[PDB]
UniProtKB/Swiss-Prot annotation, chain A:
N-acetyl-alpha-D-glucosamine 1-phosphate binds at T76, N93, G127, E142, N153. Optimum temperature is 95 degrees Celsius for glucose-1-phosphate thymidylyltransferase activity. It comes from Sulfurisphaera tokodaii (strain DSM 16993 / JCM 10545 / NBRC 100140 / 7) (Sulfolobus tokodaii). It comes from the Archaea. InterPro entries: Bifunctiontional_GlmU_arc-type, GlmU-like, Hexapep, NTP_transferase_dom, Nucleotide-diphossugar_trans, Sugar-1P_NT/AT, Trimer_LpxA-like_sf. This is Bifunctional sugar-1-phosphate nucleotidylyltransferase/acetyltransferase. The keyword Acyltransferase applies. NCBIfam families: Arch_glmU, Sug_nt_acttase_Thmprot.
Swiss-Prot record, chains B, C:
This is Bifunctional sugar-1-phosphate nucleotidylyltransferase/acetyltransferase. Bifunctional enzyme involved in the synthesis of UDP-N-acetylglucosamine (UDP-GlcNAc) and UDP-N-acetylgalactosamine (UDP-GalNAc). It has multiple amino-sugar-1-phosphate acetyltransferase activities, including glucosamine-1-phosphate (GlcN-1-P) acetyltransferase and galactosamine-1-phosphate (GalN-1-P) acetyltransferase activities, and multiple sugar-1-phosphate nucleotidylyltransferase activities, including N-acetylglucosamine-1-phosphate (GlcNAc-1-P) uridyltransferase and N-acetylgalactosamine-1-phosphate (GalNAc-1-P) uridyltransferase activities. Changing N331A: Strong decrease in GalN-1-P AcTase activity and decrease in GlcN-1-P AcTase activity. The keyword Nucleotide-binding applies. In the N-terminal section; belongs to the N-acetylglucosamine-1-phosphate uridyltransferase family. It comes from Sulfurisphaera tokodaii (strain DSM 16993 / JCM 10545 / NBRC 100140 / 7) (Sulfolobus tokodaii). Optimum temperature is 95 degrees Celsius for glucose-1-phosphate thymidylyltransferase activity. Changing T80 to F/I: Loss of both GlcNAc-1-P UTase and Glc-1-P UTase activities. The keyword Transcription regulation does not apply. Residues 1-220 are annotated as: Nucleotidylyltransferase.
């Protein structure tokens, strides 16, 4: 079976993380999203895997990925136009994290066309599956204002080469787009499209807080207590902690699991790591530094007198002493974030900041809830960051 | 003996604490001021205790007090004279001011056995601020001089009386009052002309809770004198405890916490890791004190949380307060002189070289807030991240 | 042999440290610079030592120094030539610049046995900033070129001379006038034409204390080379000590403190709980370092206190300083280039990528103060709570 990972979006909704990396390389603990997808495909015996990517990202993917074909897109309909297969293929959206491979292993043994459905609490935001009374696909309704069902399109398809025929027929939509689901809808009129319901953990990494979501799940479900580092005396560890090689934890550090401490990290003295602290790799967490429910990416340093809660901090970031993130509004309502120029609810009462790569903060910087700081920004000592900060912006 | 507690003042001097509670319910360790008063009255065998309160506070007192009569000051005159106008007794009663904390009950037990009228006197260092007792040469009361500019004596009116129903006769003589005030002491002065008013001098600890810093005063004394080392909580390893520490039930103290007594840790509190509790830290109940948080000589009331990277010194923080990370209180002027506080619109000295802030109930501070010495923050205020609070903040004010 | 220490400069380049002390009394660990110089002279058998000082500093020197002659630079002419005009000797004398720290005494012990005039040369990496020695082909002194734009050599004038009374004759021949002062080296240049001036090259550690960062330089060297692990204080349990730590008498170190040597903890200091002392922390005497306070590569002078929630890196803090809670020093520029400092009104490079602040005596910072890299704060300054100190602050200035 050939497999195609569709990873050709701009990743705009995931800014500022995607200022410096494609969505497919967002870390989940110590490894990129796309390595999970590949690994799970391979458990099903699939060997021939291709990723479809944008022109601008091709080189990044080639650097990172060894024995995987990388093809540039020449929407999801547009992406599969660059998929070269004769009979049938497995197609997965590249923004998905999924815990289970067996549904995929099943669907690649079917002769018929098939898709995966999953139940979500917000079907409004997705393609909703309407089933006929043999429980095969009737149609996919993109983002219905009144959703007839909880069952959505999971973004996992086993499609026959007949899909190209249906792709050629499509013009549409009212939202000014081609799609992939439009072609499936035409296919379902003439063919029986099976729907396999998916019961495991499923998340699309659409918005920056979803990085926290999947990292928490991974930490809860995919790893187990380990210590390959050096823990000094007077370190207190409760619950599940993963300590990778070369990580150093100094006296007075206090850890309430679950916590992930990546390779080469340097912690303490007198640090406090709270549940769902994910330190991806080579992180510096220093004295009187407290971290909670945050993803802190490769090489980033929080050396002195700082609190990082409910945040995503990208790679190579440095926080001057006394940089603080606010994670709660005064009125305790859900924290709003600007995502592609729309102000939307994160769904979280507690939410900190999203900080791009190579950011530097001066000493005594104050960051407000839900704020995005673009890659390469500088925040000047003492500043109150009360809005989004642009790529490379020097905030004074 | 009937007893009356006079608790019908506005409590304005005690703002912002009294924005959300009557003075009688100011905590002293884990219990309100009035419960001490009631408990000490009961040690003398008194059972019939009434509290006289304002109309607006009646419901609050009823909620809080079980087997105590609550009577409203049947308006509409202010002062202690007006308050005892609602006290219903036939012959004699024990009367105490509801702003007082007193360590000793035995002077009270004595005075309720006397047939004569009697009052308690106590020696203070600042008699200028009080009613001074002038004694005749049989050491009975001559007169009470309210706030004399040149005080003839250290002996003041302690606000504890055993008075006969004749006081009502003298109260009726006293001229009300464009200002709508009636002072009980004016009636006692008329009574002392015609009767022998005995004066029992009180040698124990006595304090009135007049200004917000007096909340620290009495809490300190209580911690020093009324409670003893106890641990009903859960103390992790690598907790360092020196001197006297009271840990109530369900309190959790995490590793790295360092405690220099005397310290009171109220029920359900959550401390540490890596907290520092200095002498005269009083955590009333269900308090959160987190990592890199230091507290010294402060009263932190019910449910209040100081979760990260903060220093709280010489302060009173009321109920349900939340300090954003990095909120700091200044407690010392650069010139090291006494810290001044605005009390009923007058700028006065606290009498303290070290004094922090007084924070009302339900306040929220943003991250990185800076609060200056002697500042009052009204209940329900919100302080915006990074603000420098260099003046008093109003009730419900959003300070930016 | 008579010896003269020339300590009569204004010390302006070392402001703000020299706002309250002469350069001679800058501490190196627990003792002033000049006590090292005296001690090393005495290892050579020298007993008759005189210090030449300014009129304004005479009394300070007399208070501090016991059995040492103190002479004021009479002449109101500035420079080293002017200074030795007040040196009274008949035949020969050892002359040392009072800004020098030197590890070795044996070069001095040799040079005082020579009949000829002699000077000490040392190799430095920045000869541009000093008098460069040009040697003749017998390796004697040809001439000293003050601050040559193109330096012909690494060998500079170390500021250590054994000169004969003939130097006064050459001093009388030389100009002034008065930018533009009387330089001792100009007289040595005339002397070298008529006499053989020997040059002994110095291979040990040599530093002049010219700019405020040099206080860090020499303290680091002293800590690395002159002292060894010791504990005369009281260390509580759960203190972690790595590498070399000197703890002087009466110092107290509280639980949770973490120390990465080398570190000097001076007498009577009070550390912790939960403090972090990083390499090259020098706490000269009676210092307070409190909870959640981190120090690295800094010299903190007598009686100075950093009690809460502060980071002090790559800094010099003078005597009797108090940092309000949450005072932070920045020690790195965003562009990672060398930190610049204003020194006598010229903006120059410190030569350091990491450099914090230089803080004068008796400074007080309010809570939550932010100090930028390379900033100087004059003695007696006050910094208002929440201020961002982004320029130099004057002597006694109230920065708001």
């Amino acid at each position: 079976m050939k497999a195609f990972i569709l990873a050709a979006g701009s990743g705009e909704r995931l800014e500022p993380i995607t200022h410096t990396r494609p969505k497919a390389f967002v870390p989940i603990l110590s490894k990129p999203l796309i390595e999970y997808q590949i690994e799970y495909l391979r458990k099903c015996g699939i060997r021939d895997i291709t990723v479809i990517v944008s022109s601008k990202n091709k080189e990044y993917f080639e650097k990172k990925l060894k024995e995987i074909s990388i093809v540039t897109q020449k929407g999801t309909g547009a992406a599969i136009l660059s998929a070269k297969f004769n009979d049938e293929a497995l197609i997965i959206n590249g923004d998905l994290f999924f815990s289970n491979e067996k549904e995929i292993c099943n669907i690649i043994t079917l002769k018929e066309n098939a898709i995966i459905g999953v139940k979500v609490s917000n079907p409004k935001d997705y393609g909703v599956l309407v089933l006929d009374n043999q429980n095969n696909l009737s149609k996919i309704i993109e983002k219905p204002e009144i959703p007839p069902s909880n069952l959505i399109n999971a973004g996992i398809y086993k499609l026959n080469s007949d899909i190209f025929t249906y792709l050629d027929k499509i013009s549409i939509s009212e939202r000014g787009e081609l799609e992939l689901t439009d072609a499936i809808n035409l296919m379902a009129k003439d063919h029986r499209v099976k729907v396999i319901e998916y019961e495991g953990y499923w998340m699309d990494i659409g918005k920056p807080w979803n990085i926290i979501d999947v990292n928490k799940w991974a930490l809860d479900n995919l790893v187990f207590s380990q210590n390959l580092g050096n823990v000094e005396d007077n370190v207190k560890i409760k619950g599940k902690v993963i300590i990778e090689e070369d990580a150093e934890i100094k006296s007075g550090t206090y850890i309430e699991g679950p916590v992930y401490i990546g390779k080469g990290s340097e912690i303490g003295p007198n640090s406090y790591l709270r549940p769902y602290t994910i330190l991806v790799e080579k992180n510096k967490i220093g004295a009187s530094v407290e971290v909670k429910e945050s993803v802190i990416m490769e090489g980033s340093k929080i050396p002195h007198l700082s609190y990082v809660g409910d945040s995503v901090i990208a790679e190579d970031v440095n926080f001057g002493a006394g940089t603080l993130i606010a994670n709660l509004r005064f009125d305790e309502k859900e924290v709003k974030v600007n995502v592609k120029g729309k102000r939307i609810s994160s769904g979280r009462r507690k939410l900190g900041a999203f900080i791009g790569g190579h950011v530097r903060t001066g000493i005594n910087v104050t960051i407000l809830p839900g704020v995005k700081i673009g890659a390469y920004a500088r925040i000047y000592p003492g500043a109150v960051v009360n809005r989004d900060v642009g790529y490379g912006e020097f905030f004074k």
